[PDB]
């Protein structure tokens with residue numbers, strides 16, 4: 001029920017091998033590690049979680065943009081891109097978090113569907 | 116070798132039933148109709164053309180954003196969104212033209228791959 | 231009543247010395263030249279028109295993104311960027327057309343105020 | 345040396361009276377409050393800091409997008425928008441952090457000039 005997709009606006013390509021860390025806000029207001037992974041050759045990251053495990057909560061999807069651009073030997077502006085949202089509070093939904101990256105800019109959108 | 120995808124930044128959903136017209140610049144410098152279609156329930160428009168027909172040229176992908184937003188009963192700013200590019204000039208490529216829509220803004224990117 | 235602003239998402243800067251041409255749609259559906267200029271050091275292009283000249287109608291703002299990128303040694307995807315909209319006197323009176331450029335992407339918004 | 349500008353892609357306007365909080369990363373990796381304010385009628389927030397105070401380091405700009413949308417009667421997706429970056433004295437000296445808001449999307453760029 002959670003997928004992350006990342007595209008590269010400089011290369012005109014998927015953003016491959018982008019590290020993504022997902023956190024969930026705990027009872028004590030700390031960010032607890034929830035899941036992580038890397039984008040594939042398609043720019044997509046599938047299989048982060050399950051419908052059982054992806055309960056209601058406030059989630060943070062941290063897209064490691066600096067590490068991405070540095071691995072390409074480019075000096076970027078941002079440390080990361082974060083997307084923070086409440087999920088599943090009206091029951092289970094499916095979420096795609098998409099991001100488009102440039103060295104000094106990024107854009108994100110969500111696609112939320114009810115299965 | 117050509118796919119168009121449109122998302123709605125207000126609804127957090129695919130932009131369904133968006134009309135898309137593709138033109139190709141003719142020898143006389145006019146825009147010749149090349150292909151057209153509508154986005155599906157996924158926001159994607161597949162099958163516009165073929166690798167035989169999608170020759171080198173300058174192409175214009177016109178995304179009928181005003182018609183989209185008016186069909187939803189919203190008064191938008193832009194008449195359409197255009198994406199104009201040279202295609203296949205180093206041999207055949209596959210192109211995805213993606214757009215993200217709001218009433219007063221849009222963003223587009225291209226993903227170009229070599230099959 | 232019309233200002234155009236262009237930014238560069240690769241360098242994190244204004245997009246300076248970018249050619250911008252504005253057209254008005256004529257009765258016969260052709261695009262008539264209306265105003266033009268080059269963005270300044272701030273990425274802004276002021277003084278394109280006046281209230282008296284800027285009547286309701288459909289306008290196209292064409293931004294010469296291809297020349298911009300090539301002058302920076304980058305091959306870009308687009309031939310140019312276009313922003314086509316209707317000026318409406320029932321809405322606010324000043325229009326800012328902003329664009330954010332990358333080699334394979336562009337984003338634009340309208341900021342329309344009184 | 346730091347200005348934050350927020351625009352609304354739904355209304356085609358500045359995003360007015362939006363709360364913005366700036367933090368600096370401390371030695372212990374916590375976020376220390378640094379500056380805050382609300383955007384003006386132009387969507388801009390000026391005067392957050394001074395050159396003397398704005399030393400190299402990692403900063404976070406948090407924009408209270410959720411309150412903004414709810415005050416307009418819209419349920420938005422995000423809890424807030426964050427922009428996290430490093431200030432580097434080897435680059436240009438003035439930073440503008442711009443954000444463009446929609447209910448389910450945001451876009452941001454940095455304009456860094458001398």
Ligand SMILES: Cc1cccc(C)c1C(=O)Nc1cc(Br)c(O)c(Br)c1
Nearest residue numbers: 098099100107213214215222223224
């Ligand atoms: C076109 C765009 C604009 C602003 C932000 C983003 C993330 C995009 C974008 O690349 N969206 C996008 C989302 C999905 Br889901 C896709 O399968 C593709 Br192709 C593009």
Ligand SMILES: Cc1cccc(C)c1C(=O)Nc1cc(Br)c(O)c(Br)c1
Nearest residue numbers: 328329330337442443444451452453
């Ligand atoms: C942050 C952004 C996202 C998508 C598209 C655009 C054009 C922008 C942007 O850079 N907007 C912007 C608009 C004005 Br008016 C400004 O004075 C600045 Br500085 C940035």
